Symmetry: D2
Subunit: 284 residues, 4 copies
């Protein structure tokens, strides 16, 4: 399995044509699962899930989708509330691929997209696995913006390698994961005019009209599927107190918390995350 061997494009209609890039693996396997990556500058499907896609593709038909604004998907300068935008694009892709009801796995912004998708198209989303998710999180104790969100904002205003390394270091417990190679690769993708345009567009999208669409903690009481919330105890972007409304109100919720783990559970606790996800989605 390589980036190039798994690479696919589709064109969907979201206020006009929208190119989506995704990775496909495990084509032999009956159970389809959709993977939605985190939203840090320069993030994309293959790098977000590099420790997961091969293991999951042994069990499932994996569709890892670059969200609009990321990777090789289109990077429009203008769009509405991001999670609803991304959810509409994914729904376009489900229809094109002939999918019915499919489980979704999403970290951070991708968790927000997975939830918005499961609320807007309830019959299309099966079981959800959500790692340090946006949208259904509401930090009952942590003052907003969090240390993590403030470092992301600083990069948006001053997109330097130093500001990117600072944001990456508050995303993990083990700061040695933030290697010079990782910083150089993320920064090369994040600093392009097309990426910076998307990065800011996405910021502006969460304030003003349709802010309510981002307050998904108000709505997840309506989810009827099993939902596995996964958190790093030391998440400094979407901290653990953000899990409590979702855990209380989602009828078939579970929560797993990992000590000595920040915001990148799928990287920092890859083996434990892989085994939880395989068991929760029925072993395939």
């Amino acid at each position: 399995l390589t980036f190039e061997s798994t690479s696919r494009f589709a064109e969907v209609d979201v206020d006009g044509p929208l190119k989506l890039h995704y990775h496909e693996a495990g084509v032999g396997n009956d159970q389809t699962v959709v993977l939605l990556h985190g939203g840090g500058p320069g993030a994309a499907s293959w790098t977000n899930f590099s420790r997961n896609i091969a293991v999951l593709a042994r069990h499932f038909h994996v569709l890892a989708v670059d969200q609009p604004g990321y990777g090789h998907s289109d990077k429009r300068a203008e769009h509405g509330q991001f999670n609803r935008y991304a959810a509409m694009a994914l729904k376009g892709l489900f229809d094109q691929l002939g999918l019915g009801r499919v489980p979704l796995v999403g970290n951070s912004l991708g968790g927000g997209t997975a939830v918005r998708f499961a609320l807007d198209y309830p019959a299309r989303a099966g079981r959800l696995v959500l790692m340090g998710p946006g949208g259904l999180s509401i930090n009952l104790f942590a003052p907003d913006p969090t240390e993590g969100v403030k470092r992301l904002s600083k990069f948006s205003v001053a997109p330097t390698r130093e500001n990117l390394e600072a944001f990456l270091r508050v995303m993990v417990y083990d700061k040695n994961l933030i290697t010079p190679e990782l910083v150089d690769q993320r920064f090369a993708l994040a600093s392009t005019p097309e990426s910076l345009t998307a990065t800011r567009a996405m910021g502006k999208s969460f304030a003003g009209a349709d802010f309510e669409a981002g307050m998904m903690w108000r709505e997840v009481y309506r989810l009827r599927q099993p939902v596995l919330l996964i958190w790093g105890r030391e998440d400094r972007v979407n901290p653990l107190d953000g899990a409590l409304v979702a855990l209380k109100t989602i009828p078939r919720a579970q929560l797993h918390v990992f000590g000595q783990c920040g915001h990148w559970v799928q990287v920092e606790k890859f083996d434990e995350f892989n085994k939880l996800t395989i068991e929760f989605l029925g072993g395939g």
Copy 2:
């Protein structure tokens, strides 16, 4: 595997001779694990872990120990702080069986014993799996005593079948698990003069001198092993808010919460509990 085929006794010295009953299975397997049951009237090892012992014994050398006051272990009318008493008995058994460092699995009172054991004899306890545990739990939001503890107290004062059924119903989410057969079997064991004597002795043991020994949330910052806390979201005896000091202060802690699950995780979520415990203790 039957109650009779697995039954064992040992005599240990705890302020004089103390008979301990336990169940042994998986004698072929290299990794020993000790199971410590919950403390409800009439509880014992075989009935507490009936959905777990056979599955665990495929992977591990299982020692499921009737705590002093329960099952076929001695039921003294007088003893100190219960968890320290039970921990001293277990340590006597470890020495007799020639055990070094062994992981422990404990629900409720047994979780309290497992923790007291891991604090008092730190080199003898490996990984801990603790389900709705006593002792390291401190209910930061729930007024004490909880609905669950009050129903246990009512049975101690008025040991009727009706008061026992009432206490059992607040221990599970799915009240159909509290069958007439289960109520009749627990009540027959709970109502014996020997059991009632132990039941009250144990009550009196948690107030007065050595109350600090029961406040293990003050001490678990010192635990150096991985610890898997497991809770039912709807636990009405040791509610979920009781997990937070332990999750914060134990360096290598994890937490799993099950929605639609009360105080008997090992029964109500037996399959998920079994798989979590097997993976966490290294698959054996």
Copy 3:
């Protein structure tokens, strides 16, 4: 000041004529305040706020309104979501009496009504004082129904003196406040056929398809006024964990928690409660 001397009636229109009873004191004081009582069987304005009306009436023009279904207000057999029904009745009274923007003080059910009113008619509500409030509370840790709600339901199905006493005992920290006289007085009011009709109508409304209007924790981010949340640490009906979403999402929120205090803050901490309310509402 007596029940009789302060007693007033108004007729308002909510799907037809609705008689409201209220108590008026401190006439000619510059600032009007409306008090809304809790919803336990036999509750009413005068008995709910007897340790408060005389003191508040030194500073404020006090209107203590019997909500529909309570005291001498009309006791209809059917209504929609209770808080919106009560808020529509209160709006009728505000219009009839010519009130502009008035601060509201509400405990439990009355706190829910005060919030529903402040959301639906934002220009008519000033500062809110909410004591163990319903509606905007969501018990993130406590399994629902709570011990307090379960004892209320038990009375509703078997309206005996013993079941009322059991419900009143989980309302207070100091169970000596639950005197034979209090039990007798409340039982007499709660067991009339009209009062039972109202309590049975309350049950159907809370589990009808109108339930979303009750989930005011979803909506209080919209409140623009200062809001003083007041909780008994030992509240067993609406426990302290129910404060957290409102404290987080109301911009100008404050929270005060009293140790050694249950659900009846205005009785068990009457002096401290009076003093907080007088200062928060501007001294009068």
Copy 4:
């Protein structure tokens, strides 16, 4: 009232002579109260409590004590656990001035000292008012170190004007309180060689083998007096989740949380803070 008019010195003995500086006002008022300031670089009694001393001195005999290492009190290069060191200094002052049982008001580091004092010398401490206190706080949700503590450490390693400004900005909700004049005044006091010696001695003491005496969340169940915890909802140094163990375990605890308020409650909510403290301590 001025810095100069209220300035007093005492010599006490803690492993040898120790000069303490304090401010005295309201002499001849029946009730003495001791104020203990927070621990930010350049902090001292007069600047910490300038919006409070004049008001409190109308009701109380105020002693505002510069803790060892701050203001004009001695700045030793080495000491044990800071709160016990400061509590031993305060006991020396109490004995020297002939004080009996005195209520204590402390913010942050000073709240830790007030608690250590109330635990070690229980007959000498009355009612406690603790604002965003250290020591008895344990951040159950917030990863440690907090954004606030990290900016303090950054100043300690690189004691520049820019790093001090960055630390002062996470102390307050309204960043306009952090004026060039405030930064200039604090930087001047914080960057003297004696003050840097004291701040470097503070660092070593908090990560020395004396750390257990700092974990006062383990011990405050012993406090017998009424304790008023006061928190800014937006506290980024000692965040609100740090209140929960103390609120649960102190028998006569109260908590007050101000929305739109950071770590400096006594500055950002000075009027409401003064009024709460005056009422709680008995009006004087």
